Symmetry: C6
Subunit: 48 residues, 6 copies
């Protein structure tokens, strides 16, 4: 599991990360594509 | 124990997570069903 | 220490956790009884 | 090996929310060693308040 | 991976870290040049 | 390996809270090595 998985998931659940931002993280190798797809399976902005 | 166990327990105690959200995390494989059931034995929104 | 020992000690020190909450954590296996007893030895709400 | 809560208690000492009273309880509980509490007390109490 | 990679990436996303800061961290051995380049690929200040 | 509190003290230097006097105390306490204090003081005090 990527070290920043939880960090990016939390940003998705709080609505601060967009799909574009997750693509940047995948491109950088900070998330795998599979992890970004998992994160996007959650409701965007669920915490709000 | 799942890495995000404490993250999701804290979100249940702070009243931001719902049962529906914990089920999304179990589907994602970020929590096991047993862990979601442990979290739901605590008082939701206990932190206020 | 259990993974969440510091998390629950901090909640006791900040006055957010109650004895009941610690015992729910013991019942869930997130603290040992000995850990809950050690946490309750500290001043509740010391952080103010 | 460092007690896991060493940084936690040092931060409380620097923020002025802990005094020796709390460090005494932590040492008695086995959450800090006496040597660790003496190291923390070497810092300026409340410097980061 | 450098231990402070996430710390510096978060500071960049927050808009608190500057390129100069990342370069200081590289010179200090706290980041690799490749890591500073990865961080700079993200949008500066996307977190508020 | 970095001292456990390296990031903690570097962050306090960047946020303008720590002084050289504080770093001297941390080296004397064995919380930072002298090399680490020298690295930290290389960064811009109060940058954040």
């Amino acid at each position: 599991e990527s070290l920043l998985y939880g960090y990016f998931l939390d940003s998705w659940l709080d609505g601060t990360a967009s799909e574009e931002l997750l693509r940047v993280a995948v491109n950088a190798g900070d998330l795998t594509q599979e992890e970004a797809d998992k994160i996007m399976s959650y409701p965007w902005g669920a915490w709000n």
